[model samples]
Target chain A: KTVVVTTILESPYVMMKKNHEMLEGNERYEGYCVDLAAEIAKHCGFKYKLTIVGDGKYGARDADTKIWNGMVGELVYGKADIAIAPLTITLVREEVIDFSKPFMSLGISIMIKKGTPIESAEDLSKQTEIAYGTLDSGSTKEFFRRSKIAVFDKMWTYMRSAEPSVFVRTTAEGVARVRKSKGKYAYLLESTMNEYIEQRKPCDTMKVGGNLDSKGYGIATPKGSSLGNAVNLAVLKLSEQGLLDKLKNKWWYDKGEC
Target chain B: KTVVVTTILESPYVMMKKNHEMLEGNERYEGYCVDLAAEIAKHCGFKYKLTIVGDGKYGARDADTKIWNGMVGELVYGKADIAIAPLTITLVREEVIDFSKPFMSLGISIMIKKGTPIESAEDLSKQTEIAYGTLDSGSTKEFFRRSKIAVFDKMWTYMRSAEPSVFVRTTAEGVARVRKSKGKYAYLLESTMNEYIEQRKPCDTMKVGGNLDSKGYGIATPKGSSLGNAVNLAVLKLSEQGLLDKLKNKWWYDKGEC
Candidate 1:
């Protein structure tokens, strides 16, 4: 019996290779997430098939179009038993899926062009000099929108009405907008992702503000999957052994969270 | 600037002087709990007072009498700010009170008279031939009674109706009963307490049944207290410095739970 693992194409996590058609099954998909999935499968006494998510974007729900993308969609529609991607745990995802204890912890942070005057989420919320928006219907966006906290509540108000599409199509697009627009536009993404981007070659952006909210990125599995406990424990073991951190260095630092 | 600390007389956790007349104020208090309270207060920068619980019992709620005892009562009635004693965290306590991430982890275990036939909680739960009961109305009792898990739920069923008023009023009474009952009676307590007793000179009883359930002991505070965050961080700091475990051995090994 094989566990069907769903994943997505995210640099440092997963990417289609130049010679993908000629590589072996396991070798065909190689990245931090792929390596982690292999480790979990080995520990759980199971074999698995790694299939990339059909959507081209990170796991997210489109509020306006009501379409689901990435690995979350795969699991929600029974296309896979588990998603061993760098899938983040959001309240919405948790409603339909189960995530193990975070393999990595990150905060929602703002990516601004270097030397932006805004220093914190509070500054962005109060001032209109810089316009900021989170990814469309992703964890950070939902976090700001649902927050009862003062600063974030203020941010939610601005984000709901920002002109020229407050919701970015993807993290890449968000980063591009921040880079090209100088200090005027900001992108909100996970701290881990932000940190990775900061160290890249064209690294013209910097993450500012303390975490907007605490959240985690986790290995997700379909609800009631028998492999849940074993996978969760495996991820925790990986974290305890510093394998997750090692992988992060290998992927994010070696190349970047492209 | 003053930190009001809640404590209990559970042997090495906290104890009063045998010669009560000679003691005054904080001088009356001794043992691991005292040291912890002082260390935490010093690290957190606050003056502290150690007020003994009025009833002189480990935390419990008397079902028949409707009276609360020890740190649980102190927290419930807003008599103290933090319970820094070796208080075990239970689900019931968690409902009304907040506990820091565990300072220590342990299991519910039995202190059996030497050569007892039972070896574990499972053994005792499986056969009623060997009589056993937990400390009445305490964490041990509630864990068994309120648990939805197997073995413990079964143990609770057997103990609640067992004859001979098997429930001991105090851990001392329970330990003494275990020593005298030969193979018949076994005292249930936290593993930390049991380990303490096991190291004492002329130890007549031994902990049996690997431990019924795994749980942690924490510094409990009233829900939503400002001090809660500081105390929790202090617990984590102590744990990181290895002081918490060091204190455990210092108090427990030398002279069983004070």
Candidate 2:
């Protein structure tokens, strides 16, 4: 029997190996999650298969159909046994599935070309001289949509009605806008990705302020998977042993340019 | 019908207000969690009774009896319907009780007198001129006890065998040691408590170094409780609205002296 693990193609977490075309099966892919999947399987004494999510979306439920998509949906519908990715642990997601305690903590943060004048979210909120937006269909956008706080509500208003559309379809696109907009456009994204980008080549962009909100990413499973206990114990043990930290450093910084 | 809440008397979370003899029931206590409790109840549409935990401990299990104690035990034994204190969410606790996504994030941090000349855990670990220890029966101490990492392991060995014993029974006792030991002693505690202390009167001590490990605090209820959904929604909604951050600032800094 094999455990079906559904993940996504996110940089540093899951990526096709450079010679992927010549490789077969699991050897074709490599990343943090790949390594982690192997380690977890070895420790728990199980066989697992890694499958990339079909929709290329993290996850969201359709309002009308009451259906979930992405890796999350794969779990709910019994299409997969577990999901190991950078999927956030939110209350909505938790109700439908179970998650291990976070392996990495992150928050929505601001990214700007180096030398941007902004130092805080309030600075970004107060001026139209600089433009800003978040990923169109992600948690950052939803954070603004659901916020009642005056500053955030004001930010959401501008982002929603801004001319020519401020939102971007992908994190890469949002980042490209930041590098190309010079200091005029700030991209809001998870701190993990922002920090990762800051460590990469040219080092022309930098995270400009503290996080906008705080949260963590968890390893998920269909509600009450048999593997849940073993996986959770494995994660907690690795965390305490500092293997998780070591892996993060190896993947996120070992090949870093900056 | 009222929701029964179990909590500890930790400073800035649950403490008897002045003239407690004249106050009645929930009226006698006020802090960040107290205010948060009221807010959560209001949003979830329920009345709650705040009951201080009897043992005055956070919660830990006896290996011999396989029984739990502290606020966690109250929830487990049906003595309380919920716990709204600074309870750390860990795998062991999650197996018995349910937790909402964290209301706050913290980590093990170092606290030293202002002129202590130590900047990191490595700094303390390399020398014996300065003494350091964590609160006994607490997560920080347990972190060291369970760690396989070289640095933390070394620190634990020194602490466990230190002359006259370095372990403390309470966070206050550890903080007092740091303040009174001049530059000879350092205390390891949660970042929340460390940061709160750094902002209080005298300001003779400061948090040094980045956190050694990271984690979060969540509201807890018995596993599969009916109130879980509403309370979870309240925490997430409040977190998104920044009320959680507001509450932290109010409790930890609104009365700052330094």
Candidate 3:
């Protein structure tokens, strides 16, 4: 059976190739996860096809009717056989899906335009002079909503009610907001994405402070799928053999501009 | 009345000057906090005497009798009018003393010998190949001990019981341990100290990953001290006028060797 992989168009993770319109199948795309998917499929002895999720979201449950949305919804409704992107291994998602051991680890990190005085979340939380936020409908926003820690909970209380709405719908939009805010805004997102952006051109943005919490990205599969066990073992083997590190270097630092 | 200021002898924070033998009183020492105290005293209109804490600890509540130790104890027992050092502003400490708005921001960070394969806390937590730890009697250690976060708490469980004890008594000892362990161990400490050491001689160690938590250092005084309000205002004024940033550059980066 041909495995169907659902992913996202997040930069450095999965993005359309420059000549994607002239190409077909997986050749139309390239990224860290694109290469990673190939490696996992080779070890699992399966042929797979990569398709972007219809709804551009990392996934979250609706508060009203309790429905999952985004890439997670695609996996839940059998629109795809596996998810091979930077999908966070959150507890809510795990209840209905299975995840391979984390292929990459990261946590929520702060991204600031160069010269922003803010140094940490506590810095942002205690003052209103600089506004900060996260990608709406992602694990990062949910993290703040569910957090019991005093600082984070307090931040959530403020973010949930802030005027002009601090949350953005996409990473690109959030990055744009930071660049245009003139040192008045900060963006929060996964550390891997933050680090990748820090090395890209323009170099005006920097990842400030440390992560807010610890978590990882896993190769997700439909619950009870036999592919789950093989994928988990494959990730563990790859991690132990250090190929994950090599792949990260190949994509992130090998051609780093800054 | 001369204000009694309690400080510690941590490097780059407070240190006896190279020409200390020829100097006297406050003039005998020169470092970040030394300069910072001068700035604060000037702004707050106070004449003060700088005295190093006797125990040389960052302060912790003794597990046996619940007695506070280190600079915190000195403040609580009325031995000092204020504390000016790289003292972490933590929740437990805040209950017994008042902290100025943070004069410096930092967080728990990883210190690894160059070429260590580890990149993040999760990387070290998943494998036994690299042993890691934090200083025994400070906020970093206390963070892990009191953390409700799963990964950090798990790490603490492992570190608290590891053979030979992963905890070290002093920052210098921790740095020495990392240098001699040859990538077999990692030390966790405040990012400011980690960054300072990374720029020093024989720079075989480098800070890896983002910080593990977000916090800051403040000028602390006994709870309810009239000096609290004035000192807090002084720090904010210095921060607004860019003097705090100037002081940090004078001590940390201007003399950097690597």
Candidate 4:
């Protein structure tokens, strides 16, 4: 059988190969999730095409228009059968789609240029010295928007009102902002990405303090999709076989142990 | 709509109240899960009946007969409409029934009488000086049965064939063994239940070391049950309103500050 998986071109998850244009079909991309998709397809006995998210967003609904955007919308609207990327599982997303057991764990974390004055969320919230923000249209951003915890609520208030818009369209944008801002900005992102960046070339940013909260990344499917159950068990079986760790280590830390 | 919600008589989650014989219907039950069920039903606009598990099991399919038992069986066979108990959200169970978002999280943990020599799972794996086992027909036992981790697999091998059989039919049997074994026996159970027991009077058993793995409990319904979406959102709403924590602290730690 054939399937279409919606993913994103995020580093270490899915990235275009240097000779991507010369490569054919799914072979044009390579990364952790690329291999993951191959393995899942093998285990579940299906052939699948990988389609990058149309809007290049993880997923979000327009508050005013009520239409969904990104990979999730692709699934909700029946353009894709599943998603095999590093999308965060959230309550809103669950209402619209189904996610398999978590193949990876991550947490909301603080990314500061090494040696920044801020060491913890409390430190950032208690001061006005350094700017802070999150990736737009993603779970990390929505977390602050929904948080009732005093410290996070305060951070959300400041981020919402800060002039020039603190949110970034991509993780790389947030990373660039952190590196060039002379320790004047801290970008809040997932710990896995933060740690991966910390291990990358330049290696300028460092994760600080404990995670604000913990959650997992699940392979997603359209609500009630038949493949939901098959893919769900495939993940569990692969995870039990220890393939997930091998995949994570392959892409996440293969650059350097750090 | 009228519904049958299958649950168990577990302490704190659900228990028979004093003067139960004089009570009528759902009034006979009281505990954290009872309150949770009421809230979920009220939010979803349903009237329901709470039935204690007929066979008094959390739910397991017999390895020989291949028939599911316990609260899960109730849902699978259409004997119950949903289950609002401390049932684990597991991969095997998910294939048969649907679970709402996690209402509570817990992990496999060690329980030991005060001053037991064992400090962690590693300590238990290395010696024959003491004996340890898990609650029968539950996630804790299944974890060991399925474990590929060296330490856990070794422990499982020993427990599977050990004379007198270390597995207990209930958490109470495991707890009593730990209490009466004079430091020679440790029980493996969920951290939430272990911690709650440590807080109640007698308070002789203590939870030790880090959790072996982390997972959660969910309200369950038959696969494709339409009410599944309603209860799922209700759990999320209650969690956001801080009612979940209040409910837990009420039943889980209400007896003693210790």
Q: Which candidate is the best by lDDT?
A: 4
DockQ of each model vs. true complex: 0.03, 0.50, 0.02, 0.23
TM-score of chain B of each: 0.89, 0.95, 0.97, 0.97
Taking the tens digit of each residue's C-alpha lDDT, what string does model 2 give over B118-148?
Answer: 9998888899999999876556877887788
- Score residue B15 of candidate 1 by CA lDDT: 81
lDDT of 3 at B92: 72
Q: What is the C-alpha lDDT profile of model 3 across A1-258, one tens digit per residue?
A: 999999999998898899967989999999999999999899999999999988798888889988889888888988889999989876578768876656676779999999999889999999999988899889899888877677888999989999999999999999999998999999989999999989998899999997787666878999888897678768755654456767888888996999
Docking tier of model 4: it is acceptable
- Candidate 2: residue B213 lDDT (0-100): 86
Assign candidate 1 its CAPRI class: incorrect
Candidate 3 lDDT at B66 equals: 93
Candidate 4 on A1-258: residue-level lDDT in tens?
579889998888999899966979988999999999999999899999998987789999989999989888998898989999999878799889998867787889999998898889999999888999999989988888888888889999999999989999998899999999999999999999998999987877899999887667889999988898889889867765557876777887766746
Q: Candidate 1 deviates by what RMSD?
A: 16.5
Candidate 2 backbone collisions, by pair: none
The candidate that achieves the highest TM-score relative to the unseen native structure: 2
RMSD of 3: 16.2
Candidate 2: tens digits of C-alpha lDDT, residues A1-258:
999889988778888999979998888899988988888888889998888888776777887899988778999999999998988877678779988777888998999999999998889899999999987656677788887877788999999999878998767888889989878999888999888889988789999778887788888998878897688778766776777888998989896998
Which residue pairs clash within candidate 4? none
- lDDT, candidate 1, A2-82, per-residue tens: 888888766567766668788878788677788888788887889889887775555667778776677888887788899
Ranking by DockQ: 2, 4, 1, 3
The global Cα lDDT (0 to 1) of model 4 is 0.87
Lowest lDDT block of 10, candidate 2 chain B: B134-143
Reference-based TM-score of each model: 0.52, 0.92, 0.54, 0.86
